[PDB]
Amino acid sequence: KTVETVLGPVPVEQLGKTLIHEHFLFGYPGFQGDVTRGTFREDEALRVAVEAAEKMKRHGIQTVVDPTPNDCGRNPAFLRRVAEETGLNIICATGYYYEGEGAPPYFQFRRLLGTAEDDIYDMFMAELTEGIADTGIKAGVIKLASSKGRITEYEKMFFRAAARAQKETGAVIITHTQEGTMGPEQAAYLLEHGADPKKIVIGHMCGNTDPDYHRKTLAYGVYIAFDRFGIQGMVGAPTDEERVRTLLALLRDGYEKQIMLSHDTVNVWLGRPFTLPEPFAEMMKNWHVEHLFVNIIPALKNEGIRDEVLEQMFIGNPAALFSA
Amino acid sequence: KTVETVLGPVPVEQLGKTLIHEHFLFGYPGFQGDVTRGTFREDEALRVAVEAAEKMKRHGIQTVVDPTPNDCGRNPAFLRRVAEETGLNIICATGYYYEGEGAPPYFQFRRLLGTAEDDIYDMFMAELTEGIADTGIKAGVIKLASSKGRITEYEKMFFRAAARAQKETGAVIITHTQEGTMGPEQAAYLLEHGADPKKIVIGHMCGNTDPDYHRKTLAYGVYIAFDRFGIQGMVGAPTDEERVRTLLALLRDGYEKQIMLSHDTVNVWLGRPFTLPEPFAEMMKNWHVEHLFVNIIPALKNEGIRDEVLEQMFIGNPAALFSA
Ligand SMILES: [Co+2]
Ligand SMILES: [Co+2]
Ligand SMILES: [Co+2]
Ligand SMILES: [Co+2]
DSSP string, A132-186: STTS-PPPSEEEEE-BTTB--HHHHHHHHHHHHHHHHH--EEEEE-STT--HHHH
Spatial separation of the C-alpha atoms in residues A18 and A61, rounded to whole Å: 5
**Chain B contact set for A35 (CB, 8 A):** 70, 132-133
What's chain B's length in residues?
324
Cα distances from B194 to residues B25, B110, B200, B219, B320, in angstroms, run 32, 24, 12, 17, 19
The resolution in angstroms reads 2.1
Cβ-based neighbours of B141, under 8 Å, separated by 6 or more: B65, B67, B91, B92, B93, B94, B171, B172, B173, B174
Cβ-based neighbours of B59, under 8 Å, separated by 6 or more: B17, B290, B293
Spatial separation of the C-alpha atoms in residues B323 and B313, rounded to whole Å: 15
| 3-state SS, residue A92 | strand
Q: Is A127 on the interface with B (CB under 8 A)?
A: yes
Cβ-based neighbours of B266, under 8 Å, separated by 6 or more: B23, B25, B26
Exposed/middle/buried for residue B124 (C-beta within 10 Å: 0-12, 13-18, 19+): buried
| 3-state SS, residue A300 | helix
| Chain B closest-CA separation from residue A270 CA (Å) | 10
Spatial separation of the C-alpha atoms in residues B117 and A183, rounded to whole Å: 36
Alpha-helical regions (H) of B142-223: 153-169, 183-192, 211-218
Q: Is A105 on the interface with B (CB under 8 A)?
A: yes
Q: Is A277 on the interface with B (CB under 8 A)?
A: yes
- Least Cα distance to A160 among A194, A137, A133 occurs for A194
**Contact (CB, 8 A) for A230 and A267:** no
- Bridge partners (DSSP) of residue B26 are B269
Q: Is B71 on the interface with A (CB under 8 A)?
A: yes
How many C-beta atoms surround the C-beta of residue B104 within 10 A? 24
Method: X-ray
B150 φ/ψ sector (left φ>0, alpha ψ -120 to 50, else beta): beta
| Chain A closest-CA separation from residue B303 CA (Å) | 37
**Chain B contact set for A101 (CB, 8 A):** 105
The strands making up A141-145's β-sheet, listed across from edge to edge, are A18-19, A63-66, A89-94, A141-145, A172-176, A200-202, A223-226, A259-261
Spatial separation of the C-alpha atoms in residues A105 and B159, rounded to whole Å: 21
Find which of B26, B34, B280 to mutate to test the A interface (most A CBs within 10 Å of its CB). B34
Angle (CA) A266-A272-A274 rounded to 5° is 70
Q: What is the H or E stretch that residue A56 is in?
A: helix A42-57
Contact A30 B106 (CB under 8 A): yes
Spatial separation of the C-alpha atoms in residues A66 and A132, rounded to whole Å: 15
- Bridge partners (DSSP) of residue B18 are B63
Strands A89-94 and A141-145: parallel
- Least Cα distance to B236 among A153, A99, A112 occurs for A112
Q: Is A29 on the interface with B (CB under 8 A)?
A: yes
| Chain A closest-CA separation from residue B161 CA (Å) | 14
Interface of A with B in 40-69 (CB under 8 A): 69
How many C-beta atoms surround the C-beta of residue A188 within 10 A? 16
- Least Cα distance to B162 among B177, B172, B152, B150 occurs for B172
Spatial separation of the C-alpha atoms in residues A3 and A21, rounded to whole Å: 16
Contact B33 A104 (CB under 8 A): no
| Chain A closest-CA separation from residue B110 CA (Å) | 8
Q: Report every protein residue that has its C-beta within 5 angstroms of ion ligand 4.
A: B 264
Spatial separation of the C-alpha atoms in residues B301 and B110, rounded to whole Å: 51
Question: DSSP characters for B303-318?
Answer: TT--HHHHHIIIIIHH
**Contact (CB, 8 A) for B49 and B82:** yes
**Contact (CB, 8 A) for A165 and A142:** yes
**Contact (CB, 8 A) for A174 and A143:** yes
Strands B8-11 and B223-226: unpaired
Long-range contacts of residues B302-305, Cβ cutoff 8 Å, at least 24 apart: B303/B244, B303/B248, B305/B248, B305/B251
Give the one of A107, A112, A277 whose C-beta lies nearest to B30's C-beta. Answer: A107
Exposed/middle/buried for residue A81 (C-beta within 10 Å: 0-12, 13-18, 19+): middle
Q: Is A278 on the interface with B (CB under 8 A)?
A: no
- What's B12's domain CATH number? 3.20.20.140
**Contact (CB, 8 A) for A190 and A182:** no
What total of structural domains would you count in chain B? 1
Q: Is A129 on the interface with B (CB under 8 A)?
A: no
How many C-beta atoms surround the C-beta of residue B285 within 10 A? 11
Spatial separation of the C-alpha atoms in residues A189 and A194, rounded to whole Å: 9
**CA B176 / ligand 3 centre spacing (Å):** 5
**Contact (CB, 8 A) for B202 and B187:** yes
**Contact (CB, 8 A) for A77 and A7:** no
- Least Cα distance to B24 among B289, B319, B293 occurs for B289
**Contact (CB, 8 A) for A41 and A285:** no
**Contact (CB, 8 A) for B267 and B52:** yes
Give the one of B33, B108, B109 whose C-beta lies nearest to A96's C-beta. Answer: B33
Contact A114 B277 (CB under 8 A): yes
- Bridge partners (DSSP) of residue B25 are B268
Spatial separation of the C-alpha atoms in residues B48 and A42, rounded to whole Å: 33
Spatial separation of the C-alpha atoms in residues A72 and B33, rounded to whole Å: 8
Q: Which amino acid is residue B83, in one-letter code? A: A
| 3-state SS, residue B90 | strand
Spatial separation of the C-alpha atoms in residues B252 and B25, rounded to whole Å: 35
| Chain A closest-CA separation from residue B133 CA (Å) | 4
Spatial separation of the C-alpha atoms in residues A216 and A296, rounded to whole Å: 25
Q: Which amino acid is residue B56, in one-letter code? A: M
Cβ-based neighbours of A20, under 8 Å, separated by 6 or more: A65, A174, A201, A225, A227, A260, A261, A262, A318
Domain with A85 in it: 1-324
Q: Is A168 on the interface with B (CB under 8 A)?
A: no
Q: Which amino acid is residue B244, in one-letter code? A: V
